[PDB]
Ligand binder design. Structure first.
Ligand SMILES: [Mg+2]
Ligand SMILES: [Mg+2]
Ligand SMILES: [Mg+2]
Ligand SMILES: [Mg+2]
Ligand SMILES: [Mg+2]
Ligand SMILES: [Mg+2]
Ligand SMILES: [Mg+2]
Ligand SMILES: [Mg+2]
Ligand SMILES: [Mg+2]
Ligand SMILES: [Mg+2]
Ligand SMILES: [Mg+2]
Ligand SMILES: [Mg+2]
Ligand SMILES: [Mg+2]
Ligand SMILES: [Mg+2]
Ligand SMILES: [Mg+2]
Ligand SMILES: [Mg+2]
Ligand SMILES: [Mg+2]
Ligand SMILES: [Mg+2]
Ligand SMILES: [Mg+2]
Ligand SMILES: [Mg+2]
Ligand SMILES: [Mg+2]
Ligand SMILES: [Mg+2]
Ligand SMILES: [Mg+2]
Ligand SMILES: [Mg+2]
Ligand SMILES: [Mg+2]
Ligand SMILES: [Mg+2]
Ligand SMILES: [Mg+2]
Ligand SMILES: [Mg+2]
Ligand SMILES: [Mg+2]
Ligand SMILES: [Mg+2]
Ligand SMILES: [Mg+2]
Ligand SMILES: [Mg+2]
Ligand SMILES: [Mg+2]
Ligand SMILES: [Mg+2]
Ligand SMILES: [Mg+2]
Ligand SMILES: [Mg+2]
Ligand SMILES: [Mg+2]
Ligand SMILES: [Mg+2]
Ligand SMILES: [Mg+2]
Ligand SMILES: [Mg+2]
Ligand SMILES: [Mg+2]
Ligand SMILES: [Mg+2]
Ligand SMILES: [Zn+2]
Lengths: 138, 229, 53, 208, 148
RNA sequence: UAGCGCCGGCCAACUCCGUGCCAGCAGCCGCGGUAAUACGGAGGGCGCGAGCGUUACCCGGAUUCACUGGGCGUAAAGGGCGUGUAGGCGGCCUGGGGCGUCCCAUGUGAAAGACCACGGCUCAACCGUGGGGGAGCGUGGGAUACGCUCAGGCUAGACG
RNA sequence: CCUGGUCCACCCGUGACGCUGAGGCGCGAAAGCGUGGGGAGCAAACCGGAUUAGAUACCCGGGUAGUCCACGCCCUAAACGAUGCGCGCUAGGUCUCUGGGUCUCCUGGGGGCCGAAGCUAACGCGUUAAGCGCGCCGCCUGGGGAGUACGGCCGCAAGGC
């Protein structure tokens, strides 16, 4: 009874990172993993892999955080501080290749599905294609 | 040092009082009672010791603290014994962060120390000197382990980590490192250097009290007998 | 929520009024949310005279 | 039109030196040397803490008050400045300098910009060709600024060429001295121009 | 040598028995223009003494500010307590674009070109920490790949 | 030929006299009660300049109708509660189509304006030549991840 | 006696049949209204006694509609958790209801309490979110004028929307 499994996933990651879990399980899908194939390959995480709960395929996602800290509040910095879904089931948000954005001035990344597959901002420039802007991460 | 010897009774502590952060340090609970994993200690205790060793053979002070009656005086032995500062009584606020003001009081007891054997007194109106010695006995009671520090400690020692959480703050704050004895009573992450063992029974305490102070004293040079129990 | 301490008072008012030998059972506050405490507070203490003694 | 009034009065109120009077200001008559405080009876009263507004106002005002140019013309020289590509402080100042009447004082044919304008207005100058009477004219790079073959020898012009004998002026500037010519060569970099004016307190002031 | 500009100066109050009693307080930013910036809130019974404490607390309260070409690495929005502050990095010609508070902090920070916007409550004391804790959040391309 | 506005705070520029809740100023907060930088005059200063101010209307500041970019426990804001029509939204896997959607090509998007550069009126306003755009739609070509549709299977939703 | 909802356990069946919901429809405390019953206690209105400067009140002795039943209207509220519904993800501690189990405990669904992270203008919230996300609906846009007027719709009226 999830309206948007994707924005759920991201939200599931986001809730975890904020207490810093080892991994987390999201229900598995071909398009989900295909997206994770980007977070991890761009280093927001360690990565993922196909696990099992009661016969139900999930994806365990191991989370890259960062160094400890002196002073009050030793809590590490996230590698993912900011992730939020852009094109929602409520509003489907599409760009062409010229309308493509740049997250945090080249610092962050925009994940987007296109007909050349799930790529990034840079990659859509490199490939010269647009698609549905799925989310933005930093 | 003393590997499985810490089983003597140095092991698990509380019952469902646990901060859930501490769970990576736990083995299981029998007797309905949360119990520590011991190899967990040693793996960490190994890593823990090195720090102090380093700082010892870098030649600088360490602030020993606990006020719980169970570990109260067992501090005072291994502290004088180590030749390093301690705190045995109600823990002064700003003991670090307010230091310069606290110091005005530290130098205020030592005004009484000169005044102890002095021509000045007697030629006092007899409460005036008893005032001073109540002040003295007072100045005494709260800081007898304090004067051993005239500039900010490079690490600090705590028996009960969330007991002293007051202290553990200023310390945590000033960028001063925190070494201490944590259990089911308390949590990780609020402490850099942790002893995952009981904070209560003197037995668990005495081991990590002296046998640290021992590998202290030796790292600073010379090796002595085991200390008073 | 800072009114806890009215409840806290009135329950206690009752918890001590309960343990007597003899207590009233008839003697609350005329507000509602405060009277739950005092009468149900007079309850435990009247029940604790049963248990033990 | 242009300011036209008590000039070595605003010499004062800027609290900083104004050479708008040419020679005399070099003397210890400039009144910056005499009364360094600002005009009106309140100069000799203790100054009060300037607001951020006041601060960027005066710094724009000094720079403005210098070339003796209308707030209007000043503003059109801004804008197109910020509309033109590249750093705005610079090209403002550059185009601010490329103005003929200033360029005339720049080459040295007169002591004040005031005097310099009167000189251009009277056609007593020329460019690469025909006479130009137009103080606002934009000197382009690599362009010769003569004097008039019919004004060639003239009383005021000449003595004011007799200070200008032998002294060196500007990296963006060449001069063939008693040969009366001279050339605007380079587009001035910010460094060469040195004025007691932060360019920032201008651009800032124009965001209102 | 620390530049030290004043912003907020204010007279607050508490009521005693017949009469009323005052406490001034002040906001002071501190900086060298080379990228070390700090701000602290001084307050104390008399006027200058408060400005005094202002500097002191501001003195040790500080931060890294990775000026890149004199502007800032990346655009960031920050919410501190119902007040909002936006910084977008600006090209060399720009200049400082901001209100009295966000600028003065960026002046002693020595940012040369900046685009800012003040949303939410514009109450300065809150704009203050909002901009600091904003600055405090900036990360250079370095710091980035490090963690990745 | 030099003029007009301001000089309590916002907001740049201060003193004397007159007046005494009067005469009056005023965009908001407010000012005038005998020492008024807020009224009227002067002296002085600030601003701009053949203009300076005012009234009216439009956009802005208004992030105060919030797509970008707001909210609703007590500040204004959850329908008294259900049932359900239309509509909006749609879990896993595989394929046929390609509507959305994405790229390429080609047509159109008049000129003037605007923008960049170069020039012609002594400059400028003003005008000329040249350049490059642009969503949008028509046509041909392609791509299939996501939404759509058709088809086949699944058990985590839901029901039994 | 007739009947709704809801929880558990088995993993048996169906195969996305789902969520929400403008209008619509039904329900909807008390008071009030129509018809016919009923009327002990209580009690608007009302009559007395007091108190009071007065006392069209508070207190006292009375007392009618009403309060009760049937049927039919009315459709409002501090109709309140002043918190729309559905699903997912994010420390635990505690006592209580009710199921199930290899029964100290473990586990599913309700009810409260203190509280991690986080939220918040603060108060406070916090696995029963006011957290973090998605879907949909409903409402807000300075105070008074005013929930007034006009129109429309509804009601026997009161009056509602
Ligand atoms: Mg003109
Ligand atoms: Mg520019
Ligand atoms: Mg907010
Ligand atoms: Mg002023
Ligand atoms: Mg007037
Ligand atoms: Mg006046
Ligand atoms: Mg708008
Ligand atoms: Mg919106
Ligand atoms: Mg709002
Ligand atoms: Mg409200
Ligand atoms: Mg409701
Ligand atoms: Mg409803
Ligand atoms: Mg429904
Ligand atoms: Mg239907
Ligand atoms: Mg439907
Ligand atoms: Mg789908
Ligand atoms: Mg559909
Ligand atoms: Mg055209
Ligand atoms: Mg354009
Ligand atoms: Mg089947
Ligand atoms: Mg039943
Ligand atoms: Mg089956
Ligand atoms: Mg009803
Ligand atoms: Mg009724
Ligand atoms: Mg009736
Ligand atoms: Mg009566
Ligand atoms: Mg009565
Ligand atoms: Mg009666
Ligand atoms: Mg009637
Ligand atoms: Mg209620
Ligand atoms: Mg409910
Ligand atoms: Mg309501
Ligand atoms: Mg609803
Ligand atoms: Mg809502
Ligand atoms: Mg049972
Ligand atoms: Mg439960
Ligand atoms: Mg219920
Ligand atoms: Mg609570
Ligand atoms: Mg809220
Ligand atoms: Mg309304
Ligand atoms: Mg009404
Ligand atoms: Mg009507
Ligand atoms: Zn002068």
């Amino acid at each position: 009874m999830l309206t948007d499994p994707i924005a759920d996933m991201l939200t599931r990651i986001r809730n975890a990172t904020r207490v810093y879990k080892e991994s987390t399980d999201v229900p598995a899908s071909r398009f989900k993993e295909e997206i994770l194939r980007i977070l991890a390959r761009e280093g927001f995480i360690k990565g993922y892999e196909r696990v099992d709960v009661d016969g139900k395929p999930y994806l365990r996602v191991y989370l890259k955080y960062g160094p400890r800290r002196q002073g009050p509040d030793p809590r590490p910095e996230q590698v993912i501080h900011h992730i939020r879904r852009i094109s929602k089931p409520g509003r489907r948000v599409y760009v062409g290749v010229k309308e493509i954005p740049r997250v945090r001035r080249g610092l962050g990344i925009a994940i987007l599905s296109t007909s050349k597959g799930v790529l990034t901002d840079r990659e859509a420039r490199k490939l010269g294609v647009g698609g549905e802007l799925i989310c933005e991460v930093w | 040092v003393k590997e499985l010897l810490e089983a003597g009774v140095h092991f698990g502590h509380e019952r469902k009082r646990w901060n859930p952060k501490f769970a990576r340090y736990i083995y299981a609970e029998r007797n309905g009672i949360h119990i520590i994993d011991l190899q967990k200690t040693m793996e960490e205790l190994e890593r823990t010791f090195r720090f102090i060793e380093d700082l010892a053979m870098r030649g600088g002070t360490i602030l020993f603290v606990g006020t719980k009656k169970q570990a109260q005086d067992i501090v005072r032995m291994e502290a004088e014994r180590a030749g390093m500062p301690y705190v045995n009584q109600r823990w002064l606020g700003g003991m670090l962060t307010n230091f310069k003001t606290i110091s005005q009081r530290v130098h205020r007891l030592e005004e009484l120390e000169a005044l102890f054997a002095s021509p000045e007194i007697e030629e006092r109106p007899k409460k005036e000197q008893v005032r001073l010695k109540h002040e003295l006995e007072r100045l005494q009671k709260y800081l007898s382990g304090f004067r051993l520090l005239k500039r900010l400690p490079d690490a600090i020692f705590v028996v009960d980590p969330t007991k002293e959480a007051i202290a553990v703050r200023e310390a945590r704050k000033l960028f001063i490192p925190v070494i201490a004895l944590a259990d089911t009573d308390s949590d990780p992450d609020l402490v850099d250097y942790i002893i995952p063992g009981n904070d209560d029974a003197i037995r668990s305490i005495q081991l990590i009290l002296s046998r640290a102070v021992d590998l202290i004293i030796q790292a600073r040079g010379g090796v002595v007998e085991p200390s008073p129990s | 929520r800072q009114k806890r301490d009215r409840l806290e008072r009135a329950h206690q008012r009752g918890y001590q009024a309960g343990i007597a030998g003899r207590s009233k059972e008839m003697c609350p506050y005329q507000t509602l949310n405060q009277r739950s405490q005092w009468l149900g507070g007079w309850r435990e203490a009247m029940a604790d005279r049963v248990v033990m003694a | 039109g242009r300011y036209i009034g008590p000039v070595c009065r605003l010499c004062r109120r800027e609290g900083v030196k104004l050479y708008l009077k040419g020679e005399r200001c070099y003397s210890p008559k400039c009144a910056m040397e005499r009364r360094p405080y600002p005009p009106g009876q309140h100069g000799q009263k203790r100054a009060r803490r300037p607001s951020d507004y006041a601060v960027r106002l005066r710094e724009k005002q000094k720079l403005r008050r210098i070339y003796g140019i209308s707030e209007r013309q000043f503003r059109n020289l801004f804008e197109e400045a910020s509309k033109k590509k590249g750093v705005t402080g610079s090209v403002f100042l550059g185009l601010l300098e490329s103005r003929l009447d200033n360029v005339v004082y720049r080459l040295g044919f007169a002591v004040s910009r005031r005097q310099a304008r009167q000189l251009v207005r009277h056609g007593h100058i020329t460019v690469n060709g025909r006479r130009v009477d137009l103080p606002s004219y934009r000197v382009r790079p690599g362009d010769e600024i003569a004097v008039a073959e019919k004004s060639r020898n003239l009383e005021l012009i000449r003595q004011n060429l007799e200070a200008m004998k032998g002294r060196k002026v500007g990296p963006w500037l060449s001069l063939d001295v008693e040969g009366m010519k001279g050339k605007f060569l380079r587009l001035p970099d910010r460094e060469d121009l040195a004025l007691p004016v932060n360019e920032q307190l201008v651009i800032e002031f124009y965001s209102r | 040598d620390f530049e030290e500009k004043m912003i907020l100066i204010r007279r607050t109050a508490r009521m005693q028995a017949g009469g009323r009693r005052f406490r001034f307080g002040a906001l002071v930013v501190v900086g060298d223009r080379q990228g070390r910036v700090g701000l602290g809130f001084g307050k104390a019974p008399e006027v200058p003494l408060a400005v005094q404490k202002a500097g002191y607390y501001a003195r040790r309260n500080m931060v890294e500010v990775p000026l890149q070409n004199g502007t800032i690495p990346h655009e960031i929005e920050v919410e501190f307590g119902a007040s909002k502050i936006v910084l977008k990095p600006a090209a060399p010609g720009t200049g400082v674009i901001a209100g009295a508070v966000p600028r003065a902090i960026l002046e002693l920070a020595g940012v040369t070109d900046i685009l800012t916007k003040e949303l939410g409550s514009r109450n300065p004391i809150n704009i203050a920490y909002a901009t600091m804790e904003a600055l405090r959040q900036l990360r250079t391309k370095a710091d980035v790949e490090r963690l990745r």
